[PDB]
Design an enzyme around this catalytic site. Sequence first.
Site, PDB file in Angstrom:
ATOM      1  N   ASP B 107      25.153  47.027-157.155  1.00 61.52           N
ATOM      2  CA  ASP B 107      26.527  46.692-157.484  1.00 61.52           C
ATOM      3  C   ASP B 107      27.521  47.632-156.840  1.00 61.52           C
ATOM      4  O   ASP B 107      28.626  47.230-156.508  1.00 61.52           O
ATOM      5  CB  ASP B 107      26.746  46.753-158.995  1.00 61.52           C
ATOM      6  N   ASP B 191      32.570  44.390-155.479  1.00 61.79           N
ATOM      7  CA  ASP B 191      31.282  44.933-155.899  1.00 61.79           C
ATOM      8  C   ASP B 191      30.453  44.749-154.653  1.00 61.79           C
ATOM      9  O   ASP B 191      30.600  43.738-153.969  1.00 61.79           O
ATOM     10  CB  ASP B 191      30.657  44.155-157.055  1.00 61.79           C
ATOM     11  N   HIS B 240      28.691  38.537-157.959  1.00 63.59           N
ATOM     12  CA  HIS B 240      27.472  38.785-157.208  1.00 63.59           C
ATOM     13  C   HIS B 240      26.854  37.550-156.610  1.00 63.59           C
ATOM     14  O   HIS B 240      26.855  36.477-157.221  1.00 63.59           O
ATOM     15  CB  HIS B 240      26.495  39.615-158.041  1.00 63.59           C
ATOM     16  N   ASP B 242      23.546  37.664-154.933  1.00 63.24           N
ATOM     17  CA  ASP B 242      22.083  37.757-154.856  1.00 63.24           C
ATOM     18  C   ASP B 242      21.167  36.928-155.777  1.00 63.24           C
ATOM     19  O   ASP B 242      19.951  37.115-155.755  1.00 63.24           O
ATOM     20  CB  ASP B 242      21.618  39.223-154.753  1.00 63.24           C
ATOM     21  N   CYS B 344      19.105  43.662-157.847  1.00 66.78           N
ATOM     22  CA  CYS B 344      20.189  44.344-158.516  1.00 66.78           C
ATOM     23  C   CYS B 344      19.849  45.766-158.921  1.00 66.78           C
ATOM     24  O   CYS B 344      20.681  46.671-158.771  1.00 66.78           O
ATOM     25  CB  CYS B 344      20.624  43.569-159.748  1.00 66.78           C
TER      26      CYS B 344
HETATM   27  N1  LIG Z   1      23.932  41.512-159.967  1.00 65.75           N
HETATM   28  C1  LIG Z   1      23.254  40.567-160.874  1.00 65.75           C
HETATM   29  C2  LIG Z   1      24.139  39.476-161.392  1.00 65.75           C
HETATM   30  C3  LIG Z   1      23.587  38.129-160.997  1.00 65.75           C
HETATM   31  C4  LIG Z   1      24.059  37.133-161.980  1.00 65.75           C
HETATM   32  C5  LIG Z   1      23.732  35.712-161.615  1.00 65.75           C
HETATM   33  O1  LIG Z   1      23.856  35.350-160.424  1.00 65.75           O
HETATM   34  O2  LIG Z   1      23.365  34.963-162.528  1.00 65.75           O
END
Ligand SMILES: [NH3+]CCCCC(=O)O
Lengths: 360, 360
Positions: B107, B191, B240, B242, B344
């Site tokens: 992050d 982020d 995010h 990923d 993550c």
């Molecule tokens: N960095 C993790 C958050 C991912 C949350 C999601 O895409 O459901």
Amino acid sequence: CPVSSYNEWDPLEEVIVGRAENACVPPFTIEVKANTYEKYWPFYQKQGGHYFPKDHLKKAVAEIEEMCNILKTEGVTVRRPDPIDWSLKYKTPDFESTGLYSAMPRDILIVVGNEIIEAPMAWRSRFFEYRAYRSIIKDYFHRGAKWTTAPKPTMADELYNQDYPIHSVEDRHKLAAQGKFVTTEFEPCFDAADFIRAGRDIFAQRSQVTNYLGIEWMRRHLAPDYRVHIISFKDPNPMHIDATFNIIGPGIVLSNPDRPCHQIDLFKKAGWTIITPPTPIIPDDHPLWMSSKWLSMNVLMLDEKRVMVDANEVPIQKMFEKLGITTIKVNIRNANSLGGGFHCWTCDVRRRGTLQSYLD
Amino acid sequence: CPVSSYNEWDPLEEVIVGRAENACVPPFTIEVKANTYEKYWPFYQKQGGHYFPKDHLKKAVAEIEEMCNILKTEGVTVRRPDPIDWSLKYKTPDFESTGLYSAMPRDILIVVGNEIIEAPMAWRSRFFEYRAYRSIIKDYFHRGAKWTTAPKPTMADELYNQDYPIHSVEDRHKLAAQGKFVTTEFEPCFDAADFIRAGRDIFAQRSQVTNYLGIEWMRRHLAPDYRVHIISFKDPNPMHIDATFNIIGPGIVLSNPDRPCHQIDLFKKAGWTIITPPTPIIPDDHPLWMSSKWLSMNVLMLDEKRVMVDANEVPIQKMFEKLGITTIKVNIRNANSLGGGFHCWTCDVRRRGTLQSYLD
Ligand SMILES: [NH3+]CCCCC(=O)O
Ligand SMILES: [NH3+]CCCCC(=O)O
């Protein structure tokens, strides 16, 4: 029924399109040698068991994605096989080998009516090829389609003439003419692409990968509703009939000028129009690892007056246009290298129409 | 240089793994509300400023310790952030707040070449998150790595739409589609997890925490060697990228079936293989305070043919296996609750390889 196709031209509604992903160069064994041009034998000898050139595969992926986009545009539902790594070495009690790909649905699946049939295959590297298609087939089965798997060969040494005297494509043509192929009649074997449909009549050729036992199996399995006829040609392609005698409509067929059909008069007598397409214009420097240059006539009919044809093959585009057939031009120059054109890269699952006879 | 990573798949050699220790529930402010599911809003409302459930944290610690053990087993050097009490209330001239945690290195840190970049962040409770990572970063700096800190926002009221009309996740999806996010364009913010690397091309999404000013900053800072592209998706995760579009190899990406990419054709045209993973099997009763259930596809690649995947998510394990990718199964069910999966919880500091283009 989601599955329903009796020929090569009725209005297409659903199709399965192959994948280029993780395609592997097959080990250079006798049956591979008997089905390829001398020019590439050393490629197979060296690259055997490795992936096909990845920069080339990437271009093929792009070309096939566009083709799928165009099919959806033409109103056709597209299904794709599952991604699989073909480099995995497997081992049956009879042999050991790595895989090829799931690029050509036409090589392994054939639809006759509401029945989908999985061909046995004749290459050791294509033994487990059916695995990429099982998710689609089970879905059709659940939805009511009939599902058949022709007897899977052991592919033991006895199925092949390990000493098949092929040293050039000219030798093979001679042997072929003598009734000598790399596959014996030890057990049934065949590729579905050696069969071409015209309603109640289906035409097959004994080739390097399809033997008389295999054709007889199809014949016995489909009787009495369908009749399977064996036809032969001069200087045939080692495998597959769809770039030699591609039926494009009721009573209309594309006959490869270099591979005349010994039984052409059966067709002339039925009042069939035999069209000989112009020669391919594909560059001789472009790699065609499997296949001849005749992929140009390996067209796929969306219906009787709409054909998906190669964007680069202008001379054959013109032929269709003078015949009043709308040409849907698509470029698959790099995908061609894998061994097929539009007909090979697809398997028509559903075409709108009925079972008829065109041979009268 | 100890730091050197150009993508998400080259052979991993060193990684930073987060910590669950002293994690604090963030005060329930507008930006927190815009990045979480309605189901938990009352949890944040009540627990805000207190530690996350300690019995839960303990289980997460155990799970992450095992993950680190396995990484060391796989030959990867693991660095961990410093332990810190995130409950300390701090106060800038613009606001006051308590912290969150240092659970997710992805992050806040992104490695582009031999350069480690600290993201500004967009949440008030993550303003001082970089403090947990300074010991590691100074070490890399002393050892030769380039160190960058993107402009830290004031995070004044002007950065947020205090009246952002979100009442359900369906509203947010609508607003998002209209180009309306909780963060304005008052000042740059982002982020690092909204950016994903593929050599010379980096993909970013404007999200609830990453604005156009923030993406432009990255774009301007990395030019001309790297190109930063903005892509968008249907029903995106509030923050995010990923677990929406995880690139797992040269030309291969995992596309979340529920969040299709508006620009998917750019990728199809490049000959990229787009894989849509099977659905997650995680129980709906299991708490996911931050994040959606799609953590299953938030995998970390040890190399092109080795992936660290959740031990419980069997269906996605099978997908990788049919692709010939070795699955290293690890269970982080409780760690998942904090908001992340393997990608993550880590930050790849060094992967063996070079800078290349895969978009051609
Ligand atoms: N960095 C993790 C958050 C991912 C949350 C999601 O895409 O459901
Ligand atoms: N199934 C495609 C192979 C066709 C090869 C040829 O006839 O030149």
